[PDB]
Structure formats: C-alpha cells, structure tokens
Amino acid sequence: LESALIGKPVPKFRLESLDNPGQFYQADVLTQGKPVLLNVWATWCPTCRAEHQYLNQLSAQGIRVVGMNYKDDRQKAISWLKELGNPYALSLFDGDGMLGLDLGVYGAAETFLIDGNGIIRYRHAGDLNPRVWEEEIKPLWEKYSKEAA
Numbered sequence: 001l002e003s004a005l006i007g008k009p010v011p012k013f014r015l016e017s018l019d020n021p022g023q024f025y026q027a028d029v030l031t032q033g034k035p036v037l038l039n040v041w042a043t044w045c046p047t048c049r050a051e052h053q054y055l056n057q058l059s060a061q062g063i064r065v066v067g068m069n070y071k072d073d074r075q076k077a078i079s080w081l082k083e084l085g086n087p088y089a090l091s092l093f094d095g096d097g098m099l100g101l102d103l104g105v106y107g108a109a110e111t112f113l114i115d116g117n118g119i120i121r122y123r124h125a126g127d128l129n130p131r132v133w134e135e136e137i138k139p140l141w142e143k144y145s146k147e148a149a
Contacts, residue, residue, distance in 0.1 A: 003104065003123035010038075010118050011102035018069050018091035019078055025092060029066075031118035035144040036064045037137075038112040039088075039128070040100060042072040043080050045108030047127035052084050054128060059087035063141070067091040070100050070108050113140055116148040 005011075010030045017023040030036060039055065041048040059065055067088035069077045074093060081091070094100050103112070106125055113122035122140050124132060 001106065001125055003120070005104065005112075005120045005123065008120055010114060010120060011099065013099045013102070015092040015094055015099060018067070018074060018093045019081070025090070027118065029090065030114055031116070032064065033116045034064060034148055035116060035121075035141055036066055036089075036114050037141075038066050038068060038114055040068045040070050040094075040103075040105055040108055040110040040112075042070045042108040043076040044072065045070075047109040049080075049084070051109070051127040051129065052087075054130065054133075055087040056085045058133070059089075064089050068099065069093050069095075070105070071095065071097040111137070113137055113144075115144040 010027050012027050014024050014026050017025060030038065055065060065088050067090070069091060071094070074095075077093075081088075092099070109125070109127050111124045111128050112120055115121050121144060122137060124137065126132070
C-alpha cells in the first residue's frame with residue numbers, strides 16, 4: 001500500500017550483517033550516490049522465494065540490491081542464500097523487525113527504491129516480478145540513475 005516515507009530519508013538504524021557476525025551497519029550504507037533497491041525478505045515468506053530467481057537476474061545486470069532479512073533465523077537465511085544464490089550487495093539482519101517497523105512494512109515481500117542521496121522514492125508491497133519492474137520501478141530507477149551519473 002501507500003507509504004508516508006516517499007520523499008523522506010531512510011530511517012536511522014544500526015543492524016548487524018547477516019553473513020558477517022559482529023559487523024554493524026547504519027543508514028549511511030544506503031547513501032551510495034547511486035540508486036539502490038532495498039528488498040525485505042524472510043525464509044518463511046512464500047512470495048520471497050518465488051521472486052528470488054528474478055532478483056538474481058537483475059543483480060547480474062548491475063542493479064544494486066540490499067537485502068533486509070526480516071524477523072528470520074540467520075542460519076536458515078544464510079542457508080537459503082547459499083542454496084538459491086546471493087544477489088545482495090549487502091545483507092542486514094533485522095531480527096527484531098525494528099527497521100521494518102520504522103519503514104512501516106506490512107510484512108516480508110516488500111521492495112523500496114532509494115536514490116543516490118538516501119531518499120526513499122518508491123515502495124512496492126508485494127513480490128518483485130518483470131511486470132512490476134518494467135511498468136513501475138524501472139522507469140524511476142533509470143531517472144535516478146541518470147540524475148546521479
């Protein structure tokens with residue numbers, strides 16, 4: 001559904017890396033100077049596995065994706081990435097769902113488009129498929145990719 005975060009900066013946070021125990025990241029990691037997709041997922045989310053293959057494809061095309069493991073189990077999450085492939089430039093462990101709370105997600109299966117300056121530009125509640133990418137996100141991704149080049 002709608003998001004009140006459109007046009008606003010990413011919420012402050014300090015989360016641990018999923019595959020790098022003890023390494024912590026903050027909102028600055030989402031200000032890469034280039035647009036980035038923030039994908040919320042979990043091993044218990046059916047739509048998440050479905051869309052995973054498509055994420056691998058976009059990632060292989062240069063689309064920068066940051067993964068946010070939501071209220072999940074690190075081992076299952078890591079095992080999941082080792083089996084299906086890892087498309088994420090970085091993986092954050094939102095074990096308590098605190099970042100998810102500030103982001104206002106309705107659950108797993110959610111993607112946010114963030115511009116080079118860390119501003120949330122779009123929120124898609126649902127699985128990411130070619131239709132959604134083509135018609136709804138791609139046009140924005142291209143705009144902010146150019147307005148950063």
